[PDB]
Amino acid sequence: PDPLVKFSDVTVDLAARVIHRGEEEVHLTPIEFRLLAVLLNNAGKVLTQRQLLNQVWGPNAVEHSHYLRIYMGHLRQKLEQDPARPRHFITETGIGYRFML
């Protein structure tokens, strides 16, 4: 299963909770990391906003859909070449999100 995930200039050790780009250490927030993980562990699958709020928080569903948008933004800001044009952290409009690689 291998807890060492690599996608662009980013390498993420899921076990240690550490991330390098590309590479020196990018520092994530504990919340931003549980979301990265969930996303990394569902690579390529399209996940609903409720699915994501469930897996990151649990009773923070669903009346807290905005936190998910705010933390996707943070993830893009830190990990994406162009936060405005994500290549890995992809939105499925009206549904949820999809992570590539």
Author numbering: 5 to 105
Q: What text does the study give?
A:
Phosphorylated KdpE (KdpE∼P) interacts as a cis-acting element in the promoter region, resulting in transcription of the kdpFABC operon. The interactions of the DBD of KdpE (KdpEDBD) with DNA are most likely mediated by a wHTH motif. Focusing on the DNA binding domain, this study describes the comprehensive characterization of interactions between KdpEDBD and its recognition site (kdpFABCBS) by: identifying the two 6 bp direct DNA repeats; determining the X-ray structure of KdpEDBD and identifying residues involved in DNA binding by mutagenesis; and quantitative analysis of DNA protein interactions by analytical ultracentrifugation establishing equal affinity binding to half-sites with no detectable cooperativity within the limits of the data.
To determine the structure of KdpEDBD, X-ray diffraction data was collected up to 2.5 Å resolution. Overall, the structure of KdpDDBD resembles that of other members of the OmpR/PhoB family of proteins: It has a central three-helix core (α6-α7-α8) bookended by two β-sheets containing four and two strands at the N- and C-termini, respectively. The C-terminal pair of anti-parallel β-strands (β11–β12) that form a β-hairpin structure constitutes the wing of the wHTH motif. Likewise, the α-helical and β-stand elements of KdpEDBD superpose well onto PhoB in DNA bound conformation with deviations restricted to loops connecting α7-α8 and α8 to the β-hairpin structure (the DNA corresponds to the PhoB recognition sequence). In the superposed structure, the steric clashes between DNA backbone and Y191 of KdpE indicates that the α8 recognition helix may have a different tilt angle with respect to the major groove to accommodate the larger side chain of KdpE Y191 (as compared to T194 of PhoB).
